[PDB]
Symmetry: D2
Subunit: 329 residues, 4 copies
């Protein structure tokens, strides 16, 4: 054999140490995949979906670029045995919202899908961290948590990580500063009831609210509330123009995967259980700033909310428990 | 204003971008090129151009929303080529794509017609640009971009066989249990059915595979290495048949070429250039041969030493491509 | 000749680089700057300059030998500033460094005399560069570079408190068990003993530490956070006492600023610039405040809302610096 | 407490997943450290030396740059407990050659130090790969292998990875081509008896020797043999000029760390046992092209050498054994 004339083998299997699985090879799952590959976060990437040809073709397309990557194994199957020994399993599967339709309207269809995905993930990686991206993300993270049986630290929702990045993009464009230097937090539900925390909005530690006490309210002459309205409407606008969103969420997810895989312990506004904070007494999930690392969410930052901000969060939390109420699974 | 209370402007500056890239076409390929380029930190400005206004604005916006996680401070788009002004590299990914069982060569009249609009508009605003053609048939379209643009040949590059050779090296690597980076091998000629695997150059750590098995790549080859080249030719149609199109691998291949041009690396790639003068080819044929790629595009060509059969195959590729070039009307 | 048998040349390029960085000084600091810049792929040419010829050639060769692992295709050095021609960024790390216990201000006459030779040579070969001063006392030396160059103030930048702030964020990170990337806090003014920690701006996730502990940064502070700023001030001294000099952190900090400059990022950094017109400063004093840094250097300053005490501490930091500064001979 | 006002702890404290240790905080050691930090290869970096102040100063100086890095933990100590659970341990400690002293004259000093270092490293990191950098590297890889009790695949000498990079640089400089596209192997000893394999030297698969049959001989009108002489003399020449070498070895070691940490299975010219190749009968370690991954060296490429190249390699082997046979430990 040519191989044996060229190479002397000194050692025969191959068990991966930093394997990530993406479930779902729609535009979101593939944006996640490419972003993860291009940040060198994994030594093995695994893809899962229910449409076989699509799945195989996406896999092969990625494999063809292997010369330009540093992830030496890309695999795919409809069978979840392909996901075994994953450190991180990202779930991007499920129905997506139509133009002009709330994410809340996807809830029952995605819960039924999760009734199938999640036990299969747990079976083959019982110690992985779950990163839920599918919408409505906050409820679907609760559902993943109940179905998996994992401790809460290891079930993370992508939440408002993207919402906050969009906020910082828009704030950046207004101020003429890079988003990395513009700080601002969008908390609560990833959707219409998200809460811009105007109190924390700042550049170089300078509170924008101190310079404009009306910041974010109807009294704001500069109308900064529209920045949050633009954050809320962003998906809707992108959906209207191109039919769907993919790139920003892929970057946003790869950002969270970077914190988890490298144990960075950066703070991200992501979905976690908030029972105990802000008078919330149920098993509700929504975005608060969390410390994220190798063990998932280890700690939560307690943001000091103004009665207005606290009210709006109360309301976000209420909207979500209102839907989560009726669920069986 | 809140901006003026927070920030004292100290400098009135109308600045031009220094490392600008434009991608023409926001189909799956064009956007794969875009995301790859942005995640490689190659550009200080990215311009996107297309003819479908909504799709264009949406793609732009989706990338912008990712800005926190990137290092490219300005992403812009328009139907109007003024948005491309002062680009260092202009990547052209627009045009019809081949159907299952259709040859890339059948795309010629449709994509030429489109290049007649795109190319003059694109070169108008960027004196310093290199032209990177990705649209198919890429070799013929690189010749066409060259003739329409009137650029010197060093500045008009076809993505060519960079992806073909990347696929070859992936498949070789899988066969040998070695990373494609350490598996060397060149597929030259047409990016298409007449490409030529250069078996004489196929090697790991400078060790020639042909020297160990002189039957390598022939029908007598017991390991049937010729099937690896077949798989290379068949790759686009296999992926098209499965997912409907290809995107990621060509995006990564184009980004690789973008990296060599933007960073003046002078690495060697198999890409489309004029080969008049080599291997007895006396006509203006564009096709892939190993080229040194840098800030001024292709500055030099590597003269590969081909066996008489490899050379006949490369001239057959050349003949095919030349015949199609004779179909062109400017 | 082998080169010519192997390669056909297409054109004679000017080879004038597009993203050249020069580091002046090949001491520990300059070399740390160099390897961080190389490893961040910021430049297409890196040029080194020093007066000790052997050391200079040795460092250049040692960097060259790793080129396979880099993406910076030309690395050059000379005592002659012809080698720095067409730099976009020139980083000056040359001069005396403080011994253990010695003050940065004690370096001033030595490093001023050195800058009398350096700065006019830099300008002759790169009249359009941004100057980044790392030598100490950095606040005074940036003024000196500024006066000597005749450059506009935007293009003469001092590394300032960029490092001091990073040290602060590290120590804060360590106390809270959070990455420094997520712990925010600003140290402004002189880069040295009179720097000012801005306690009002210290926060995680937009949540003010001073709001939770009103006595933050004072003598009353139960947790003694003042010790954190004390640690910042003492950092250089503690490292010098242990290893004889500092290099890595400042190398990283300088490359951070190089990134914002070379990639036109418009990030905000606490670096030295002329603050004439702020905080009741009427003289041409350079010290650190938050600046927007891009391809034209410092285009904007963020007006920080200082407490009366904070503003005083800075007016003091100012006064100290102008005392020495006004009376310099060049 | 302020931390507790700011942060709700949700999870009791952490074992690192991608930890690297560098033993020796000399110029080489720190070059390895900074290169590894700037390549995001580690979630934790440990330093070890025997000079307490220097050790603390270097750790501190690296920590202060943390903001600019993605390795959240940097630790040091004279005590090897600080090295626990490393996946890679890099040994850079030992005397270095004077100007005009062979690396081979360092052997008794550096074997004595390895008798302490190696059992201590292996005590605390039973899963690690050992990357030997200290000189003479080829003999010290053998030594660390016999002391450790590790299988030979997990004891790697940095060997000729640097020499080949040097070769490739010099080659590229001559041809006006980037080193990445200039191929050429220097094998055998990391020292004066290394062997340029002229037969393998090529751009784009074009053999330079085929174009110029006299390549690498005294008959060569262009004297490419002086390229290999420069490779051999590089260390000496740089030591003569700056007092020591650090950056090229640092980067060369980072390159190997990347292939190991990311299971790349790339091919490197590195120190391994060659007993049973080219007729060598003894336990000699020297550089040949090896496939390098998560289990260290899994495979060796059998380079087809010309008779003279082969003789030169056997000669390098002989030199190494003549020093090795007389070793006590
Ligand atoms: C039993 C079964 N097993 C499987 C296994 C796999 C699959 N496969 C798929 O379902 C793939 C198709 N679905 C898909 O890709 N959905 C993505 C959802 C999405 C869209 C947009 C955003 C971000 C966006 C926003 O929040 O709207 C913003 O903010 O920009 C987030 C999430 C189906 C099944 S059924
Ligand atoms: C007057 C006008 N101005 C414009 C401006 C913009 C646009 N925009 C579009 O046309 C967008 C759609 N076009 C598109 O995405 N084409 C991609 C072609 C492609 C596909 C696949 C591969 C790789 C593949 C292979 O070689 O087959 C393999 O090997 O994997 C390479 C190339 C239209 C017009 S009309
Ligand atoms: C006419 C002439 N032309 C030349 C040309 C070149 C050279 N070459 C040198 O002078 C080389 C030696 N000099 C050196 O490396 N100085 C480094 C200064 C330094 C040290 C430490 C920090 C950071 C530190 C802090 O800020 O104190 C902290 O906080 O850690 C910052 C700056 C001399 C001459 S003379
Ligand atoms: C019981 C004990 N435990 C310890 C623990 C730690 C330490 N610490 C040190 O020993 C620190 C100083 N040592 C040092 O830095 N040695 C580097 C050797 C070196 C230099 C240069 C190259 C590359 C070069 C070439 O091959 O020459 C080329 O080719 O460029 C390779 C290797 C001592 C002891 S004693």
């Amino acid at each position: 054999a040519l191989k044996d004339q060229l190479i002397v083998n000194l050692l025969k299997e191959q068990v991966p140490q930093n394997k990530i699985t993406v479930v779902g090879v729609g535009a979101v799952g593939m944006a996640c995949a490419i972003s993860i590959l291009m940040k060198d976060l994994a030594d093995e990437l695994a893809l899962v979906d229910v449409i076989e040809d699509k799945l195989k073709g996406e896999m092969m397309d990625l494999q063809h670029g292997s010369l330009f990557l540093k992830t030496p194994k890309i695999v795919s199957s409809k069978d979840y045995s392909v996901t075994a020994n994953s450190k991180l399993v990202i779930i991007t599967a499920g129905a997506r919202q139509q133009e002009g339709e709330s994410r809340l309207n996807l809830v029952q269809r995605n819960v039924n899908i999760f009734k199938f995905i999640i036990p299969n993930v747990v079976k083959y990686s019982p110690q992985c961290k779950l990163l839920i991206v599918s919408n409505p993300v906050d409820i679907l993270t609760y559902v993943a948590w109940k179905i998996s049986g994992f401790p809460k630290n290891r079930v993370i929702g992508s939440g408002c990580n993207l919402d906050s990045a969009r906020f910082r993009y828009l704030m950046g464009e207004r101020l003429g500063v890079h988003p990395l230097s513009c700080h601002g937090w969008v908390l609560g539900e990833h959707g219409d009831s998200s809460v811009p925390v105007w109190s924390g909005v700042n550049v170089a530690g300078v509170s924008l609210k101190s310079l404009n006490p009306q910041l974010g309210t109807d009294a704001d002459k500069e109308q900064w509330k529209d920045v949050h309205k633009q954050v809320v409407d962003s998906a809707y606008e992108v959906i209207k123009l191109k039919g769907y969103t993919s790139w920003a969420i892929g970057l946003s997810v790869a950002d969270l995967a970077e914190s988890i895989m490298k144990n960075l312990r950066r703070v991200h506004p992501i979905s976690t259980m908030i029972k105990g904070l802000y008078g919330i007494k149920e098993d509700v999930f929504l975005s608060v700033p969390c410390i994220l690392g190798q063990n998932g969410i280890s700690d939560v930052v307690k943001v000091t909310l103004t009665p207005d901000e606290e009210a709006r969060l109360k309301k976000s939390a209420d909207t979500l428990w209102g839907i989560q109420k009726e669920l069986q699974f």
